[PDB]
Amino acid sequence: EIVKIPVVVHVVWNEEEENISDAQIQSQIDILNKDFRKLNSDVSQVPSVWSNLIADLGIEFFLATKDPNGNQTTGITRTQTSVTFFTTSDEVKFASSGGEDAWPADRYLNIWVCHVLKSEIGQDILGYAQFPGGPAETDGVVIVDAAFGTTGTALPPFDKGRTATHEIGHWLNLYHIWGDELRFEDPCSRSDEVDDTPNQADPNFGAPSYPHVSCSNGPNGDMFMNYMDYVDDKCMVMFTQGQATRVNACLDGPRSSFL
Amino acid sequence: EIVKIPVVVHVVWNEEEENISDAQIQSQIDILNKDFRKLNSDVSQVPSVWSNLIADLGIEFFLATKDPNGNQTTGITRTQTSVTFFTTSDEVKFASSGGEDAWPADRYLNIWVCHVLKSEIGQDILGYAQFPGGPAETDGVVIVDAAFGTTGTALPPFDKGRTATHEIGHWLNLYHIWGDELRFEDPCSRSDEVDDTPNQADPNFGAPSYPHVSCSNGPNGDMFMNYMDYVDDKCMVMFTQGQATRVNACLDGPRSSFL
Numbered sequence: 001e002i003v004k005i006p007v008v009v010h011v012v013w014n015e016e017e018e019n020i021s022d023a024q025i026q027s028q029i030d031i032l033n034k035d036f037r038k039l040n041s042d043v044s045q046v047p048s049v050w051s052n053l054i055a056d057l058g059i060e061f062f063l064a065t066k067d068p069n070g071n072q073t074t075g076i077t078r079t080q081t082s083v084t085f086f087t088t089s090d091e092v093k094f095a096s097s098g099g100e101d102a103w104p105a106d107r108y109l110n111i112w113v114c115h116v117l118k119s120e121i122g123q124d125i126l127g128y129a130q131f132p133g134g135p136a137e138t139d140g141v142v143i144v145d146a147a148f149g150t151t152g153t154a155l156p157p158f159d160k161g162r163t164a165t166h167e168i169g170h171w172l173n174l175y176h177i178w179g180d181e182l183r184f185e186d187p188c189s190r191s192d193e194v195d196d197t198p199n200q201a202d203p204n205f206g207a208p209s210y211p212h213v214s215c216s217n218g219p220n221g222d223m224f225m226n227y228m229d230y231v232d233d234k235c236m237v238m239f240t241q242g243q244a245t246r247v248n249a250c251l252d253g254p255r256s257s258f259l
Numbered sequence: 260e261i262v263k264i265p266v267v268v269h270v271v272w273n274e275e276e277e278n279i280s281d282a283q284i285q286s287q288i289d290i291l292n293k294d295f296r297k298l299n300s301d302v303s304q305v306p307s308v309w310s311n312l313i314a315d316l317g318i319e320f321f322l323a324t325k326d327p328n329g330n331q332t333t334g335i336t337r338t339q340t341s342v343t344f345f346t347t348s349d350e351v352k353f354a355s356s357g358g359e360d361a362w363p364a365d366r367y368l369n370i371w372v373c374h375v376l377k378s379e380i381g382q383d384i385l386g387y388a389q390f391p392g393g394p395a396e397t398d399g400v401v402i403v404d405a406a407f408g409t410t411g412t413a414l415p416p417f418d419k420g421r422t423a424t425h426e427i428g429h430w431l432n433l434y435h436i437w438g439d440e441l442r443f444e445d446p447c448s449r450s451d452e453v454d455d456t457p458n459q460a461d462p463n464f465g466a467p468s469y470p471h472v473s474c475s476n477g478p479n480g481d482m483f484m485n486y487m488d489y490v491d492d493k494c495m496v497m498f499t500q501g502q503a504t505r506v507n508a509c510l511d512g513p514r515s516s517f518l
């Protein structure tokens with residue numbers, strides 16, 4: 001009952017170095033096929049207290065072999081642009097705004113790769129996702145090239161393929177583990193809608209030491225090694241079974257076309 | 260030297276009550292032609308302390324009389340939908356996702372009106388904007404019908420037409436007055452890029468009393484009666500001259516097509 005998802009990678013490049021190699025792209029696909037099957041070896045990093053909660057999402061990914069017209073494809077498009085940065089406003093997802101149009105969202109997972117991404121207020125970001133239910137025109141994930149794959153332009157600490165794992169988590173209806181409070185809200189007040197992810201104050205960055213306690217969640221602390229936190233690639237290594245329930249409802253519902 | 264912006268309002272309705280009247284829509288236009296001209300009678304509410312800073316933005320709005328093909332229009336489209344809520348993912352801006360396609364962004368301000376709006380993570384919202392520079396397909400503003408205009412379905416405390424004023428402020432390149440810090444950041448660290456808006460910690464809600472001091476901006480405090488704060492309709496009544504400058508730069512640059 002493994003769900004196999006066809007992927008198209010849209011490389012959008014301004015300078016030649018940003019037109020990343022097949023090898024770099026393939027290395028990311030390989031990572032997704034580990035993380036989404038619980039075949040990543042660093043799963044051994046999960047605290048013993050949570051070692052029974054680790055999920056095999058039962059999802060695999062392959063670069064599409066047929067394009068939306070039925071013609072053979074490598075599963076990779078490559079589009080030269082004069083645009084120097086893209087934002088969460090989705091300019092990368094339309095040819096008219098210097099990016100590349102989405103392939104049918106009911107048949108493919110669209111991944112756009114570009115050099116520079118910013119939030120609306122100019123914060124540098126590595127990637128962003130569209131949750132299920134949105135318009136097909138902008139469905140998929142976007143990851144910057146220096147945070148994509150495990151070779152080529154990929155740079156530590158984002159050189160282990162986990163930005164894409166995190167964004168595809170969102171694509172499958174998963175929320176940030178800490179609940180996404182706004183600055184005026186109590187840091188312990190919001191939920192990620194998953195019971196087996198401990199309540200958590202804020203995102204964790206970098207390489208935290210276990211345990212990292214917040215919101216009176218001791219002695220075990222934050223599950224900062226979940227892909228839906230903000231830690232360095234080498235530190236995030238698992239989805240929970242509670243998260244798998246959400247992913248499965250997404251696959252059984254809004255993304256049933258992939259079944 | 261008044262800039263006159265042609266408007267199209269896309270009413271997207273599921274239940275007939277959401278198919279709002281011409282009068283309700285017209286009442287919103289009337290409000291915009293006041294707020295953006297410093298003609299709102301409640302501008303008198305601004306503490307005299309800042310009377311020197313209150314701006315006439317010199318912008319007016321009209322419902323388009325010609326559609327994108329040059330045929331007569333009322334400047335209002337009405338689209339029936341089976342969709343019961345829209346999100347910040349822009350479903351309302353595409354017919355394919357149960358909404359209505361944008362008119363050319365270089366010639367019209369697109370305003371969508373729907374019954375229920377949510378953020379990505381399910382928070383109820385009254386409206387949202389796209390900032391300049393984004394793809395034309397999604398350019399414009401979205402407001403919920405209960406927060407649109409001053410009659411019909413409009414409900415207090417969002418029955419003075421200020422949601423649209425706030426959103427159109429974003430459309431013209433204005434940022435939240437308090438700087439949009441993330442939960443974990445110093446609340447005094449970010450700027451709205453406007454000198455004459457006092458440095459402000461957090462958004463203000465409801466009906467604060469003057470003064471509301473934050474970030475050592477005493478004795479006058481936060482300019483919480485600015486349209487780009489988060490206070491009730493009845494409490495937001497002004498733009499500043501510094502904001503007028505940013506807006507003029509937007510019309511002189513990315514949105515010069517409207518000149």
Ligand SMILES: CNC(=O)[C@H](Cc1ccccc1)NC(=O)[C@H](CC(C)C)[C@H](CSc1cccs1)C(=O)NO
Pocket residue numbers: 088119120123124125126127128129163166167170229230441
């Ligand atoms: C060098 N850049 C980073 O490490 C930034 C830091 C940051 C955090 C919040 C806001 C702005 C910047 N983080 C990201 O890129 C996130 C992805 C992780 C897994 C690397 C990314 C943030 S997207 C948002 C923009 C605005 C609000 S949330 C995300 O959650 N995608 O789904």
Ligand SMILES: CNC(=O)[C@H](Cc1ccccc1)NC(=O)[C@H](CC(C)C)[C@H](CSc1cccs1)C(=O)NO
Pocket residue numbers: 182347378382383384385386387388422425426429488489
């Ligand atoms: C009944 N609901 C409300 O009053 C919500 C409350 C709220 C605030 C922040 C996040 C989620 C909900 N406020 C809005 O709808 C804002 C408009 C005001 C002027 C009325 C609206 C929030 S859009 C965002 C979604 C996520 C992050 S910011 C806005 O700034 N548009 O430009």
Ligand SMILES: [Ca+2]
Pocket residue numbers: 088089090138347348349397
């Ligand atoms: Ca969008």
Ligand SMILES: [Ca+2]
Pocket residue numbers: 191192193194195196197198199
């Ligand atoms: Ca949880």
Ligand SMILES: [Ca+2]
Pocket residue numbers: 178179180181187188189190200201202
């Ligand atoms: Ca939290």
Ligand SMILES: [Ca+2]
Pocket residue numbers: 436450451452453454455456457458
């Ligand atoms: Ca300011």
Ligand SMILES: [Ca+2]
Pocket residue numbers: 437438439440446447448449459460461
């Ligand atoms: Ca602030």
Ligand SMILES: [Zn+2]
Pocket residue numbers: 166167170176
């Ligand atoms: Zn994320």
Ligand SMILES: [Zn+2]
Pocket residue numbers: 425426429435
């Ligand atoms: Zn706003």
